[model samples]
Target: SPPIHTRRQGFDPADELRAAGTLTKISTTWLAAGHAVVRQVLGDHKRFSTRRVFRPRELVGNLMDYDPPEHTRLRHLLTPGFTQRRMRRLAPRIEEIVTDRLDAMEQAGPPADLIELFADEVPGAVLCELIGVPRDDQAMFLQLCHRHLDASLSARKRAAAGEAFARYLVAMMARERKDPGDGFIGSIVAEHGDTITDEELRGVCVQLMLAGDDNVSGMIGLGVLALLRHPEQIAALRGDDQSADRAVDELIRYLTVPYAPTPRTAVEDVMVADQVIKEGETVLCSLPMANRDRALLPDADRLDVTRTPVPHVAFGHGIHHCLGAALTRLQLRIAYTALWRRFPALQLADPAQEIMFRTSTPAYGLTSLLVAW
Candidate 1:
């Protein structure tokens, strides 16, 4: 079997410890690479807590840094908006957003960067409408988010963008307080009034904006490149709804953009795969490696869009698993299907151009992709 530690960025710690099995250590932290071991850590949130894995200040109202009770409260409040039924309601707007972006791309002409016109725009627009950001404020919100997440930018710019986004969220939450619209934030305001504070509500919106923006956009840009590299798969998806949904799932596994799950810190010594991760130890789950584990599927490394329902943790496993999974899937399904249907002949604008993968941030995706149809 091919080695599971194929990707270096997320799984390098595990790769370097190839002789070791299941769990390995970075300082006091443990790295869980073996499919079973990673699952064990994520599944048992009791022993391994999520706190401090993500800096709470980095993204306001981030529940990624919370444990049960506090985590449970926030999760319960937010989960209602992300249910399949709710996401289904948002599907048409997502499709409309996708179509509008495609129309813009067509009007803009070929030899254009899909990242600029479509990939980045669609998710940002969809999320803005979904979160009930007023139509006029969507552009600023999107720009602030783009700058906030773009690691390529200088610290000065990124910091300013972060500050601006935080301020924007506060103001947006205040607007909802005065006269709530029927969106995610509005729903929260309407139902959980006073129970969830204004600051907390503002923070949740900021977190959602960050969560929903770049990750899906990155997938859209990279998913296109992946299909272009494998023309047969592209052909399979052309105007085919069933194939498109299957292709989206396969692509989610294949790319697993946020290559690593939120690091889990062990609160008590726990034995996983014959190794004990002692208290105060941190464990990181390599989603890229776990998704590609030969145990997960036959020929796991190969990108076969038709491969039926390979169990992959593209969205992390267990309770902290992505709440936005449905929305992400809906966006991808609409975007991929629309792209191919709109431009059946779409191809890389310059095959000779080297693909630039964005590496500065935790989210892995293409920085720029030029395509012509």
Candidate 2:
């Protein structure tokens, strides 16, 4: 059986939430699973404080880890770098990366693990390019990023990986400080100068790599699987750009890759879904459950590529909404469209083989998927 978070049991979380009611208390934490309840908790930053959720050292420069004033200042400094216009300019480069991965997969021939040759590779490469990781060091850089996020790994090993990532970013940022390039770090350094500190820059870059890599990779891998099962909807991806855009959002909503956003703790007594959450109490919002709620859409469990896109909480909501939402959308739009065009007859290499889902990881995705043209 797949993990409960994946909803492989046919809307497990949503069913449990419906049975238990929207907000349920288990031990010390209050779980918010209803669509409105989750949004209310996430959007009300003042009432539900984001501070002290993680250690001070781990929280540096991460917008999700801070509330107004501090979060506002950091967000302001980084906002220009991720604007829709700025993200749009990278479409050609993203297309190039997607095409390069497709070529590699084609060269490897049938019975290829799409996760290895394409899904995982595309996002890592795009992120490296976006972050200014040198061409030679990107492989090692991505490995560290993967190891750090691999939940099965020991705490000490993951900690080591995190430390190595920080060291590399610190050195890279120092170099960018001396001579700014076109990458995210260099561009920010060039524009903001001393206004954004080295630590803050390092934190933002780390957050970007961590936040973007697995989530996009998961979307690409699991999304292809979803389309293959609902082969009828695969044509939507091959349609015009607008059709592909609609298809991508539906996939994101259905997948809801990240199980939950960083848990928020109540700053004061707040009434949510008829329950009074006490001060300092923790709140965990199940993104998958909220997205699957009937209130959010009709036929919520069905994968309908042609359905009009709704504002889903997959990228999250409120001030801490994903900084790379535009970038992720652009990558998926190019990736899904290009993959089907490159291999029109794409299908599972062995239909009977049980899928190996990444059950322990922070995000939901296939560990490996063998496919053929």
Candidate 3:
């Protein structure tokens, strides 16, 4: 593998580890690279708190920034909206979204940037529909989302984008509160009614858009790049439903796009992986390293879509586990499968072109990938 490919796959933590082993101190914060240690820090909310992870402004109604019983209450109200039953109902719609993108790609002809035409568009569109953003407003809504997450943008600009995003959500929530549509917000308003506050609804919707959009887009873009590099494995994506499920999980584990979950602050002293983490300290779990840890599975670096799916922290762990795990998995499965089926001969336009990876952003993804069938 080339250097870029090696980094994308995973990095060995041997040189970075301290004599203390699994847990190493970088400045005042602890880094948990080993599989077991990462799980310990993420799983133990009683000892490690999520309450102070973000600024007060960033924490509004977002479940990631809340601890129980507040987290418990919010999650309970939102659970029904993401049930397996709900996802099943959503499958046909997701299929349509994927097919629409594929059709657009075909109409646009060859040498198309998949990132712009397909990868970038699918997740945001699906999320907009899921959240009840009107079809006409979706393109602008996604631009705000992209701007908000783009690291190259000035902080002030991103913050401005955040405000616009929030304002739109507030108006959407107000509309949903009056006459509930069938979208997630409308359904929740209809069901829970006054029990869930307007602020919480806005926060949850904002969190969903932030969480769901870029991460899935990154996976689609990078996962396709990985598959293109390993053409033999591409077959797995178009295989039976069971195989496609295994393939999507394997791709997610291999990529582990988000560098780390929001840092967890220790509420009390705790022992993890035989190391004592003191109170008031923060711990960061490296999702990429942990997924590739030898302890997690054999030949972890290799992308073997046929292997039985292993529980990976690609979606954090325990209480903060991704609320949309099933939704993400479904989208990837549909997107990957439909894409290859539509363009079985798809390949990069310039195989030797310098690949532009999104290094500055929180998720690892291609900036653009030109492909032809």
Q: Whole-model Cα lDDT per candidate? A: 0.78, 0.84, 0.83
RMSD for each model, in Å, please? 3.6, 2.3, 3.4
Q: Kindly give the number of clashing pairs for every candidate.
A: 0, 0, 0
TM-score of each: 0.90, 0.93, 0.92
Considering summed lDDT, which 10 consecutive residues are worst modelled in model 3?
2-11
Write model 1 residue lDDT over 71-116, tens digit each, in one string: 8898888755565777888888888888888898888889888988
Model 1 Cα RMSD, 1 decimal: 3.6
Q: Which digits, one per residue and each the tens of the lDDT, describe model 3 over residues 175-197? A: 87788887788778778998998
Candidates ranked, most accurate by lDDT first: 2, 3, 1
Residue lDDT tens for model 2, 325-362: 88888999999999999999999999998887765657
Candidate 2 off by > 4 Å: 1-18, 53-55, 151-157
Clashing pairs in 1: none
Model 3, position 61, has a per-residue lDDT of: 67
Q: Which of the two candidates, 2 or 3, achieves a greater lDDT against the reference?
A: 2
Off by over 4 Å in 3: 1-21, 53-55, 151-157
